Design a protein around this ligand. Structure first.
Ligand SMILES: O=c1ccn([C@H]2C[C@H](O)[C@@H](COP(=O)(O)O)O2)c(=O)[nH]1
Ligand SMILES: O=c1ccn([C@H]2C[C@H](O)[C@@H](COP(=O)(O)O)O2)c(=O)[nH]1
Lengths: 262, 277
């Protein structure tokens, strides 16, 4: 209903009423189109307690997006291998849109249209805007990527002071990806809400085709067997007025008492 | 679960009850992250609670599909919805004084057919075709999560006379059924929200026609979903009105090309909305 129980029954949606569809690997998936969720960013943070979610990959991948560097090796230095040059990925699109790409050894600042900042600039000036958006979809660059963004874009909305984010994710797996990126885009709200000096209202998670791999069924069926435990509430120690100034040590996650994974 | 126009009205209701007031001097009631499903199987989601302009919906898509950014072409057919923005009083107000009558900017139809083109004339072969790439892909790989048409081009956004309100859609194919989900950043429950529902549900009806598919659903996802404070009193009398059965959209001509589509290829069986007030 209100919480992780949205997601947790999104599995019981696709494991029951889910439709047979095929995966780009060629493995079978159970699919569903057009889901939606609302996760509460006030008083708490939505990190999955049903299965332990990788937190510091969630944190380091983001700051890697805020940097604008598309590379494996930079994040592999954090002992994070989840990702040479991936091409013009989110990190590029966020900070530079419509800028000619060579590789990430080239400096892409000064160029494109920086979305992340243009969202920030617009929040402190225009109290109300529906046009504040970060788009990861550029069909010209896309063929140059190692993979099209599963997260097409986000949009920000402010009412009575509290910031809300909706992220449109065209495709996600319930076992691996969406739990990860739930934290990921709920993480960005906290950040931009911080700079703009606003609060955290809600995170709306919108999914296109949402599947479950036919391996992950029983694994997912073990997970739902577990009563979810109370979400964490996140704190930001150092108050930062720049977006590229955020790093790991400014983050303290309290209240994570997940279950043994897999 | 609702799945109907009953949902749309439930949004209006949940907006009107719980709406938060955001003043632009014209304030509205606003909520965020609304999603509604509209069944496209054996009915057309044309809203019956109040009459939607049909020939406008039909003529805009063709105007979208062929890539037309020119509003004069809709007016010659006496569809005037877009002719305000191509009106000289509007273009010279906003700094478009160098742009001529009917010139809107790169907009949906342009971004659809040519993405990353350079707006001026004849753009054929220029930019990326978002529409023809989806129909080609549905033929080749009906299972893909990568089929999307996005109108957002922040580089070209300032060129646009108005930024795209429906910023992109996605297509999904299963059971020989073609579906669609449009993300709308902003929509007005009283005027334009029901209007797009027709345009995209028609495109799905079109694309399913070209690809040889059926129509599963149209999922309408809204960004800020708002009611201007002045539509309220007039709106709530549309609340007590109970929506009727959806009409029957059909295509009497088998059309192998999406540019070959004409206003004369459809017939609506069973559409009878409520009178005004
Ligand atoms: O945050 C993420 C990132 C990636 N994926 C996976 C799901 C799909 O298997 C795949 C997308 O590949 P395509 O369907 O676009 O080919 O990425 C997720 O589920 N969540
Ligand atoms: O399909 C549409 C097209 C336009 N609008 C109206 C609503 C807003 O008043 C305005 C967009 O406002 P901004 O996003 O530019 O702030 O267009 C809609 O509601 N639905």
């Amino acid at each position: 209903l209100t919480g992780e129980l949205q997601y947790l029954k999104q599995v019981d949606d696709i494991l029951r009423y889910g439709v047979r569809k095929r995966d780009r690997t060629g493995i079978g998936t159970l699919s569903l189109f057009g889901m939606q969720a609302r996760y509460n960013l006030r008083n708490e943070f939505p990190l999955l307690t049903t299965k332990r979610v990788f937190w510091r990959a969630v944190v380091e991948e983001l700051l890697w997006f805020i940097r604008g560097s598309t590379d494996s090796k930079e994040l592999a230095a954090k002992d994070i291998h989840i990702w040479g040059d991936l091409g013009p990925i989110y990190g590029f699109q966020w900070r530079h849109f419509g800028a000619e790409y060579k590789d990430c050894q080239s400096n892409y600042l000064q160029q494109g249209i920086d979305q992340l900042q243009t969202v920030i600039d617009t929040i402190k000036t225009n109290p109300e805007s529906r046009r504040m958006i970060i788009s990861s979809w550029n069909p010209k660059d896309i063929p140059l990527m190692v993979l099209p963004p599963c997260h097409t874009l986000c949009q920000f909305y402010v009412a009575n002071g509290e910031l809300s984010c909706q992220v449109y994710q065209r495709s996600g797996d319930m076992g691996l990806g969406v739990p990860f990126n739930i934290a990921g885009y709920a993480l960005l709200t906290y950040i931009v809400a911080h700079v703009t000096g606003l609060k955290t209202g809600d995170l709306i998670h919108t999914m296109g085709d949402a599947h479950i791999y036919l391996n992950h069924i029983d694994a997912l069926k073990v997970q739902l067997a577990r009563s979810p435990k109370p979400f964490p509430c996140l704190k930001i120690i150092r108050n930062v007025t720049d977006i590229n100034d955020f790093k790991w040590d400014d983050f303290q996650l309290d209240g994570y008492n997940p279950h043994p994974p897999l």
